[PDB]
Amino acid sequence: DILKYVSYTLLATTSALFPFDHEQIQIPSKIPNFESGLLHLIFEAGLLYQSLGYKVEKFRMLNISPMKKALIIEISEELQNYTAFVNNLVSSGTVVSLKSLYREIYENIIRLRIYCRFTEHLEELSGDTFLIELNIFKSHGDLTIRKIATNLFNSMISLYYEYLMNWLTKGLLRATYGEFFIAENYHIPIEFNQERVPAFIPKELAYKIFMIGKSYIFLEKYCKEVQWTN
Amino acid sequence: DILKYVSYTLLATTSALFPFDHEQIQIPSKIPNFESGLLHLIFEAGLLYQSLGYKVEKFRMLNISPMKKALIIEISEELQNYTAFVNNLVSSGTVVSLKSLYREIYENIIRLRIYCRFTEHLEELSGDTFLIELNIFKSHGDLTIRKIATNLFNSMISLYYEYLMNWLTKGLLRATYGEFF
Amino acid sequence: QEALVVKDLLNVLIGLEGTYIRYFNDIEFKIAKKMDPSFKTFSRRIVRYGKQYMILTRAYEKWSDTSFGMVLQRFAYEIRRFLEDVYLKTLVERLERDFNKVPNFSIRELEQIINETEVNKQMELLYNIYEEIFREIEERRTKGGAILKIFQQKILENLGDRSSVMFLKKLLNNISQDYCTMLYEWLTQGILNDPYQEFMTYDDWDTQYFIRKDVLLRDCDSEEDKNLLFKMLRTGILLKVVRASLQIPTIPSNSSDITIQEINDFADLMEGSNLELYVDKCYSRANEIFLKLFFQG
Structure with a gap:
């Protein structure tokens, strides 16, 4: 029975029989000291998973940056592993120690926190x-x-490379939610966003790309050019 | 035993041990819920086959349009495939799941309905x-x-082409049952 | 108590349309719920799975055995087929193993894998079919062209989320084909097709053709869109007048552009440059045959 509740909490289902404040158990003396302590440690890990699982689910509602979507996808796949683990522990650890339970699922704690x-x-x-x-x-x-x-x-960058290819080859790729360094302002211009690029693309490099791109849009306005060797 | 009746119904032979209304089982609680549900799905498929098989057999009595005959022939040949399938399932699926039974004979449902x-x-x-x-x-x-x-x-048109050739080359080809204009 | 309850729960999952596990047309399937903490958590997970399975089957019936759009029919047959296939194969196998070993074995492992597979594909698929239906209800009160616009708009709309978009693209390329067949026939050989909807072009010596605005345009206003439509009407009229001229030199005798159009559908974009490439080729073929009819005959 004790193992079972603890499992529910690790599944990201809130248990009626451990109180939820925001980080730990507040369970009175009425149950073994020894098990309560062990139980303290489990809840920290289980709380972290539930909280992350709520965030990923909520941010999932589509019609956002793909760059966000690509993170939510990676996150969701990584959470899967956790759920498989809880299952191994219940299956071949029906009466299993909480201290031991805590050690086995150690790696997953290190990963959640950073996320x-x-x-x-x-x-x-x-x-x-x-x-x-x-x-x-x-x-x-x-x-x-x-x-x-x-x-x-690796997931986000695949997306940039695409946006860049649309931009350079066929002109105007607007950022929308921020997919590129195009900023607003027939006769309405665009301009350069130095701020958005991380350090991995220099601001100078990005500008040159903006400059070239600007010239391709000007070639199509003159009178539309057919898709060449470029 | 459960598989066997279900097979009879797929063969276009009515089983005594599932009630026939016109589309489904009306089998009471007295048997596993789980199997009854699976059993619900089987009957829809099996009902469709039986009903089509009755139509083709009845319209077969000759001295009709060949254009009709040519449909009845194509239909009858297509039904054959079904009967061969039931046979594979009994042979190498003696104790086999009804949910699974339903999935395997999926394509044939799509085909019958349209017909x-x-x-x-x-x-x-x-x-x-x-x-x-x-x-x-x-x-x-x-x-x-x-x-x-x-x-x-392809079957009906072969017939038109013939009727047309009689008409144009040697005069008067009467429609009779409607073979021509 | 605990072993029996877990067992009842496993048995039930292979057939929720049972004789004690009842169906409500709108809740879903419901079974009486029992005690144990473990069971009530598990019944909640099961509920979600169950709801989507029942709904996918309702939706599918409406679209099948009857016509509202050619596109709608194709989308339903395909959607159902994939989804069912996955669910039965994993579930039937998973349950059998559990049963073989000792039929009280963890529900949890069966749950995590089916949840993963479903989630991405299923949500998007089911919402989309409904959105297309509301929109058709609105159009009717106010067709073909309107369906193409909505689905192109939806691929743009969803953006990111790789599993779902690639799945939807595979369906989209199959759906595009009737529009492709109509465009090749109209632009290259002068025949407008329309059994009840297949585009949004209608007729009206040499006659005239025009776009049904009510059915909605291809990309519903844009300068590129407008020129392209005007160009499509012009190529098609030349061809039809020449087809009318009997067995006096007809049918372009230069090469086809079906192969060029088909690569545009597989792309699943609405970009001006590809589309423009298709019309100028069709246009030329139509111009040269047109000339030949006139000069020679």
């Missing part, structure tokens, strides 16, 4: 801003953090 | 009218419906 910082920063800004958020995080040490940051990156 | 619309329209009119019935049906979307309609067509 929770990220989801928080996702709230502030939209689009190409994520790549910057992503760049500062990679700068901090530890084999894991960098790895987790690179995997989000 | 049942056709047989209904065959009742109203006779002869060259079928080609019109056939033309409106081809107009509706889906890769299958058009295909099924074209196969009926």
Whole structure:
């Protein structure tokens, strides 16, 4: 019975028989001290998962940046692994120790925590801003953090490369939600956003791209040119 | 035992141990809920086959339009495939799941349904009218419906071409049942 | 208590349309709920799965065995087929294993894999079919061309979310074909097709043709859109007058552009440059045959 509730909480289903404040159990003396302590540790891990799972689900409602969508997709796939783990533990650990339970699912705690910082920063800004958020995080040490940051990156960058190809080859690709460095202002111009590019593309490099692109739009206005070797 | 009755119904033989109303089982609680549901789905498919099989057999009595005969022939040949399928399932699926049974014979359901619309329209009119019935049906979307309609067509048109050749080359070919204008 | 309750729960999942697990037409399927913390959590997960399964089957019936759009028919047959296939194969196998070993084994493992597979595909698919239906209700009160506009708008709208968009694209390329067949016939050989909807072009010596605005335009206003439509009407009129001229030199004797149009459908864009490439080729073929009819005959 004790294992079962603990499992529910790890599944991201709130249990009636452990109180939820925001980070821990507040369970009185009336139950073994020893088990309560062990139970304290489980809830921290289980709380972290539930909170992340709520964030990913909510941000999923489509009609956002794909750059956001690509993070939500990666996050969701990574959470899957957790759910499979809870299942191994119940199946071949019916009467299993909570201290032991805590040690086995150690790696997943390290991973969730870092992600929770990220989801928080996702709230502030939209689009190409994520790549910057992503760049500062990679700068901090530890084999894991960098790895987790690179995997989000491979997905977002695939998207930039596409937006760039539309921009350079057939003219005007507007950012919309921030997919590019086009800013507004027949006769209405565009202009350059230096701020959005992370350090991995210099601001000077981005400008040159803006300049070239601007020239291709001017060639089509003169009188539309047929898609050449470029 | 459960598989066996279900097979009979798919064969176009009515089973004593499932009630026949016109589209489904009306079997009380007294048997597993889970199996009854699965059993609900089987009967819809099996009912469709039996009903089509009765239509083709009845319209077969000769001395009609050949254009009708050519449809009855194509229909009868297509039903054959179904009967061969039931046989594979009994042979190498002696204790086999009804949900699974339902999925395996999926394609055949898609095919029967469309045909049942056709047989209904065959009742109203006779002869060259079928080609019109056939033309409106081809107009509706889906890769299958058009295909099924074209196969009926190749058979009927062969007949028109003949009637036309008699008409043009040696004079007077009367429609009779509607083979010509 | 606990082993029996877990078992009842496993048995039920292979057939929710049962004789004690009842169906409500709108809740969904419901079964009486029982105690144990474990069971009530599990019944909630099951409910969600169940609701989508029942709804996909309702939707599918409406669209099948009857016509409202050619496109609608094709979309329903395909949607159902894939979804069912996945769900039965994984579920039937998963349940059998559990049963073989000792039929009290974890529901949780069966749940996580089916949830994952479904979620991405299913939500988007089901919402879209409804949106198309509301829109048709509105159009009717106010057709073909309107359906093409809505689906192009939806692929743009959803943007990102890779599983769902690639799935929807595969369906889209199959749906595009009737429009492609109509465009090739009209522009290259002068025949306008329209059994009850297949585009949005209607007729009216040499006669005239025009766009039904009510049915809605191809991309419903834009300068590129407008020139392209005008160009389509012009190529088609030349061809039809020449077809009328009997067995006096007709049918372009230069090469086809079906192969060029088909690559535009697989792209699943609405971009001006590709579309413009199609009309100028069709136009030329139509111009040269037109000339030949006149000069020689």
